[PDB]
Design a protein around this nucleic acid. Structure first.
Length: 199
DNA sequence: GGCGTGCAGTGCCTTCGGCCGTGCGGTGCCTCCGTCACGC
């Protein structure tokens, strides 16, 4: 449908080589479709787009004052990485420290849509749960989205085990996205308040 | 000549030096299998 609520949504795209050139474009299209079903505004739904590999490469910020159509273009032109490493620990650390360093919008919900499709090196996962728990303390909901046979199930279930609102969406392939979009959007929307503060 | 340790972290508390602890790279399910450098 169309989400018109106070929400800060953060898209986190796995940049590993697990996803092919094409398969990644599909993921991007999914993110674009999501955005078409969101009321993009500083006072309603704010969006952020981040392709992550060894590190986080942000294309869109929550405070970016741009026309939604423009943002959709940007989100569709996200460059393919195809890295050997897509650190979820790093992208969650980035989200926690860079994106949500300061909670400037209490009146809205904070959601991190973690689109993963691989397994990061175990040594990198050392402080993983600490970032997830750290996001929780800033009241940021993390929704893992498993894509493909290589998506780290252990971490995904570990995210759910961290917070009540943290639900996972285990998928079979990037094709399962389009036919799961509507369900996901509505789920995220129902986590955000509908009406602003009295002001 | 075996051991036992190694150390991340916008770290933490009992503050300017202990205490916890994935030495580390890389495979592919995981919190790990198999491996190297030092000092003694």
């Amino acid at each position: 449908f169309y989400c018109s609520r106070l929400l800060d949504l953060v898209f986190l795209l796995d940049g590993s080589s697990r996803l092919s050139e094409a398969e990644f474009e599909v993921l991007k299209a999914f993110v674009v479709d999501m955005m078409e079903r969101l009321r993009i505004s500083q006072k309603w739904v704010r969006v952020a787009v981040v392709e992550y590999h060894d590190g986080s490469h942000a294309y869109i910020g929550l405070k970016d004052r741009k026309r939604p159509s423009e943002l959709r273009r940007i989100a569709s032109q996200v460059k393919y990485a195809g890295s050997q490493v897509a650190s979820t620990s790093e992208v969650l650390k980035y989200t926690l420290f860079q994106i949500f360093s300061k909670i400037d919008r209490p009146e809205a919900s904070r959601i991190a849509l973690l689109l993963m499709a691989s397994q990061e090196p175990q040594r990198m996962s050392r402080n993983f749960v600490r970032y997830v728990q750290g996001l929780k303390k800033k009241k940021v909901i993390v929704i893992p989205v498993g894509i493909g046979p290589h998506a780290n199930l252990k971490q995904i279930r570990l995210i759910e085990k961290q917070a009540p609102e943290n639900k996972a969406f285990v998928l079979s392939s990037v094709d399962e996205l389009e036919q799961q979009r509507d369900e996901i959007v509505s789920y995220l929307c129902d986590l955000a308040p509908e009406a602003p503060p009295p002001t």
